[PDB]
Amino acid sequence: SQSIVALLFSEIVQYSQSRVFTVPELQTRLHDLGQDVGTRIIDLYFVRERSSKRETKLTQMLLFVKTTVWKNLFGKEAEKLEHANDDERTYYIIEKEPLVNTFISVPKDKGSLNCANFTAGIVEAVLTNCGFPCKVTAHWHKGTTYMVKFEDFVIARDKQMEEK
Amino acid sequence: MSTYYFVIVGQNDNPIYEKEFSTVNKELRKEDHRHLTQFIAHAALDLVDEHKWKTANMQLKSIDRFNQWFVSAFITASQIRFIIVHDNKNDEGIKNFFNEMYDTYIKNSMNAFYRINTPIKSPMFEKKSEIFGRKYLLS
Amino acid sequence: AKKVNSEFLTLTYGALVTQMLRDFENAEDVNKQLERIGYNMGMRLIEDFLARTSAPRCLEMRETADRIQQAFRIYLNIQPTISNWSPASDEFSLVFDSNPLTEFVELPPDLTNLRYSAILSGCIRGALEMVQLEVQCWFVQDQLKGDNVTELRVKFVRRLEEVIPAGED
Amino acid sequence: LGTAQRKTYDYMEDAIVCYLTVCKLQQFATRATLLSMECLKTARLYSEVAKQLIRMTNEESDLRSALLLEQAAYCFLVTQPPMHRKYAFHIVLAGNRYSRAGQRKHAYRCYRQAYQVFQKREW
């Protein structure tokens, strides 16, 4: 079902909300779960759904891994992608569909951040396992949005291989 | 004959596992092979990282050829460094052999109990590797 | 439609199990903890399976048995197969060939005393208790333990919901 | 002069390592490789010096072979990460080579160098 996953994920959040004391470390725990997901999904989908061939270059892998992960997760690719000049490290990936709202969401007083961070955790896993260590923030701006802070050695590395 | 040596390297450069099939003799010298090549997998890696930054090919058949030690690279989406090192060439075996390595690796990587860059002791994987070696390398 | 991929649910369940193994050292605690969360699952699973279909309350056990097998085939998309009745017809066994939760995961040998997919037994428990119906359910055979397919027991010891919807509460 | 002609650099190797295949004038070959290393080190091809120092290590002797392995070690590491722990692995063999005949000072300091990048790359 849709609703079985929503229920299992409510028990996710509740187990955290139990043996976790404050919200940001709860988001951290969600992020850990996301890393756990990515750690194996990325290696799965190298072959079956990613042309079986590796892709290394940044923006192509960003968009294509975005899409392939979303097709084999929900079958719905993220609606848009922004990469920001003002900070070349600052890219935003934004999807109007929150994974969270399979169960419609939490109290709007205590926890500013939600599953949005857990999806961001899966994102971080796949990026850093492709070769792209990054930190990702989930913001309630224009719906569920994300922002990625890549790795400095990585950012120099692709900035150099911007040419061949 | 051909010598047989497989290596598994975590993202954090951790040598996850290594597998052998060569005719057993002078085990001390086979361990010398192991560390020789495990530490050859070091520059091989320092090389093949930029080599993979060049080409995102299926498999990097050759990275270095020490004129007696041969470096064949099949790097993964999770950047798991894989190398076969041998005193003799057998390309057809090695290509789809690294393929089937990758396959059974996916199989035993899915299990949630495994975490990134961790040795895997599953003797089931050992016999899967052995069957592959008898298929694609050994006769 | 379920609008979701079986592997993603499997990964979330694996995330739970691994996180329990970490946070709490013992299998017995993590198992009782997950059984509690599954108990609390059932309190919503059973009302959902009622919202999809207002099944009859109960005239007999096997009526509840095929109701729940219908539900199992609903959310898990997998047709179960009831079997192994009591001489008294009170208790039966339930068969899952392959649970998306249970499958795509095998078990490290240290965790033999763990009962992995027990979240479903908890689900059944809480589902039967919000429906004010007293039953005992444990997986007599589990796919992981070397059993052919996951086998449960469903021991309906007594009743808590009456013939009139006033009931005892 | 500053021209640092890559043409003359490659010709030089054609009259050093490639001349070792023609005649047995290893004396003149090693003379060429020696200054070709320094001129290619000032250039940017430090891995070039290292590769021909490895092609001189196999011959050389014992103290000499270890000296050329130590030269190859730093040369390949200087240009780029390439050889960041295999250089250390081969100066462990060059370390005992120096000990057999390799300078005791050279032996200890190349061993210390190896241990430094071993801790850096413990795995």
Side-chain angles (χ1 to χ4, degrees), chain C:
Chain C
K2 176 175 174 65
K3 286 182 205 67
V4 70
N5 297 114
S6 173
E7 70 279 26
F8 163 57
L9 191 44
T10 301
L11 271 295
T12 42
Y13 185 62
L16 282 178
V17 181
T18 307
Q19 197 50 74
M20 301 326 198
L21 266 296
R22 281 166 276 164
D23 304 323
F24 314 137
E25 56 85 17
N26 47 357
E28 299 78 346
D29 185 75
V30 305
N31 194 4
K32 182 174 71 68
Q33 164 71 42
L34 62 83
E35 286 148 2
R36 295 195 301 281
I37 76 181
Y39 174 91
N40 195 326
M41 281 275 208
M43 320 185 97
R44 271 64 176 169
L45 184 142
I46 204 58
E47 64 83 23
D48 191 276
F49 175 56
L50 196 153
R52 304 214 81 94
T53 176
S54 293
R57 308 283 64 62
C58 180
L59 183 63
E60 62 171 350
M61 301 335 307
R62 69 190 67 185
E63 206 172 358
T64 79
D66 71 357
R67 291 159 208 166
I68 71 172
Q69 81 90 21
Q70 165 189 355
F72 268 120
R73 185 192 60 257
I74 286 182
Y75 308 112
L76 273 297
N77 306 359
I78 51 170
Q79 163 61 35
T81 43
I82 308 85
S83 79
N84 198 15
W85 292 98
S86 162
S89 83
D90 185 74
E91 56 273 19
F92 64 92
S93 302
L94 203 44
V95 178
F96 300 146
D97 183 68
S98 52
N99 297 115
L101 309 169
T102 305
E103 305 318 296
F104 263 80
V105 163
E106 63 87 20
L107 271 293
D110 52 354
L111 267 69
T112 47
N113 56 345
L114 160 71
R115 298 173 298 109
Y116 182 74
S117 65
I119 180 169
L120 294 175
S121 180
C123 288
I124 291 178
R125 181 61 42 79
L128 272 300
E129 192 57 28
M130 182 36 88
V131 68
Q132 321 86 23
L133 287 179
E134 192 66 327
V135 74
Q136 294 297 109
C137 62
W138 60 108
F139 300 177
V140 60
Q141 277 87 19
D142 186 336
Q143 217 162 348
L144 299 150
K145 310 260 161 179
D147 310 307
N148 300 345
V149 292
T150 75
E151 195 77 59
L152 300 77
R153 289 308 311 174
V154 185
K155 184 53 72 63
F156 183 76
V157 294
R158 209 187 62 266
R159 185 99 175 202
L160 312 169
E161 167 73 19
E162 296 183 357
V163 293
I164 182 155
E168 53 163 7
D169 185 34

Side-chain angles (χ1 to χ4, degrees), chain A residues 12-78:
Chain A
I12 301 299
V13 168
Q14 287 166 347
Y15 170 71
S16 76
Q17 180 94 317
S18 73
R19 59 96 175 168
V20 163
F21 291 66
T22 183
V23 61
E25 61 156 30
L26 192 139
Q27 274 94 27
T28 318
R29 300 296 296 163
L30 266 72
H31 186 273
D32 299 345
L33 300 145
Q35 310 300 137
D36 201 331
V37 179
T39 300
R40 41 191 77 91
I41 62 170
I42 190 167
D43 215 3
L44 281 154
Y45 292 116
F46 166 71
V47 285
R48 291 189 182 182
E49 310 194 21
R50 285 208 167 77
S51 50
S52 177
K53 170 80 90 169
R54 182 181 322 104
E55 291 83 4
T56 303
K57 305 311 157 219
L58 182 62
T59 68
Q60 61 84 23
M61 181 285 318
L62 191 154
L63 267 179
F64 173 65
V65 162
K66 167 191 106 164
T67 55
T68 297
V69 171
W70 281 117
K71 298 293 105 175
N72 47 38
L73 274 187
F74 293 98
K76 194 268 183 183
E77 78 286 11

Side-chain angles (χ1 to χ4, degrees), chain B residues 12-15 36 39 42-43 45-47 50 66, chain D residues 76 81-87 89 118 121-123:
Chain B
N12 305 357
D13 292 331
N14 304 109
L36 184 149
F39 298 153
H42 294 173
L45 187 153
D46 301 327
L47 294 174
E50 76 265 15
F66 291 95
Chain D
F76 224 108
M83 240 114 122
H84 225 292
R85 237 252 101 231
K86 197 218 112 27
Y87 97 98
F89 144 75
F118 222 155
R121 156 189 244 137
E122 19 96 33
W123 5 258

